[PDB]
């Protein structure tokens, strides 16, 4: 699949809004991920002992991990699909070091869209939502192809 230039514009304007508060968006996304799909928390050895949303919001380690994930996703999105070099190390680490199945990438994609809706009422309409869904689907499909090459 491919996104049109119009669709990429929609994605990057939304992302520039995320960049006004990377840490807050990353906290909200990880917390939504763990509340909607609690098994995903087991993959995060650094903070899988956290038990409540209040503990998650207070965790400096969780916030840093959210910043790192959103920083990398923003860099990838800015490549507008020409992301082969940037995606390679991420697919490698998530397949073999962190052991993240594709379904967990689907779960975090759902969490991303929900947090964008929640944080940007009136500025995340049907076109931007559809474009962001396509951008995240392309990201997952391109990771899944690298997973396949690694036999994961
Ligand atoms: C938008 C999707 C994601 C992006 C862009 C992303 C990005 C990153 C980056 C850049 C790192 C640090 C460098 C590296 O190890 O490659 C990282 C680490 C990690 N990621 Fe992801 N990630 C995503 C989704 C996920 C999901 C869904 C999970 C688990 C359910 C996950 C689990 C981890 C773990 C456990 C680490 C190591 C964290 C630590 O140091 O404590 N990632 N991720
Ligand atoms: Cl829109």
Author numbering: 0 to 151
Reproduce the article's own wording on this structure.
The high stereoselectivity of this carbene transferase is dependent upon the configuration of the two mutated residues in the distal heme pocket, which enable the precise control of styrene attack to the heme–carbene reactive intermediate during catalysis. Using a myoglobin-based cyclopropanase as a model enzyme, our studies show that covalent stapling with p-chloroacetamido-phenylalanine (pCaaF) provides higher stapling efficiency and enhanced stability (thermodynamic and kinetic) compared to the other stapled variants and the parent protein. Crystallographic analyses of singly and doubly stapled variants provide key insights into the structural basis for stabilization, which includes both direct interactions of the staples with protein residues and indirect interactions through adjacent residues involved in heme binding.
Structural alignment of the model backbone atoms yielded overall root-mean-square deviation (RMSD) values ranging from 0.17 to 0.47 Å (0.20 to 0.87 Å without outlier rejection), with the two pCaaF structures determined in the space group P212121 being the most similar to each other, while the sMb13 (P21 form) structure is the most divergent. Thermal denaturation analysis of these variants revealed that the combination of the two staples produces a large increase in both Tm′ and T50 (Δ Tm′: +26–27 °C; ΔT50: +24–30 °C; Table 2, entries 9 and 10) compared with the parent protein. Another potentially important structural feature that leads to enhanced stability is a parallel π–π stacking interaction between the side chains of Phe106 and pCaaF36 that is observed in both sMb13 structures. Most of the singly stapled variants, including sMb2(pCaaF) and sMb5(pCaaF), and the two doubly stapled variants sMb10(pCaaF) and sMb13(pCaaF) showed high activity in this reaction, producing the cyclopropanation product in comparable or only slightly reduced yields (84–100%) compared to the parent enzyme. In all cases, including the most thermostabilized variants sMb2(pCaaF), sMb5(pCaaF), sMb10(pCaaF), and sMb13(pCaaF), the hemoproteins maintained a high level of diastereo- and enantioselectivities (94–99+% de and >99% ee), indicating that the staple(s) has no impact on the configuration of the active site, as required for mediating stereoinduction in this reaction.
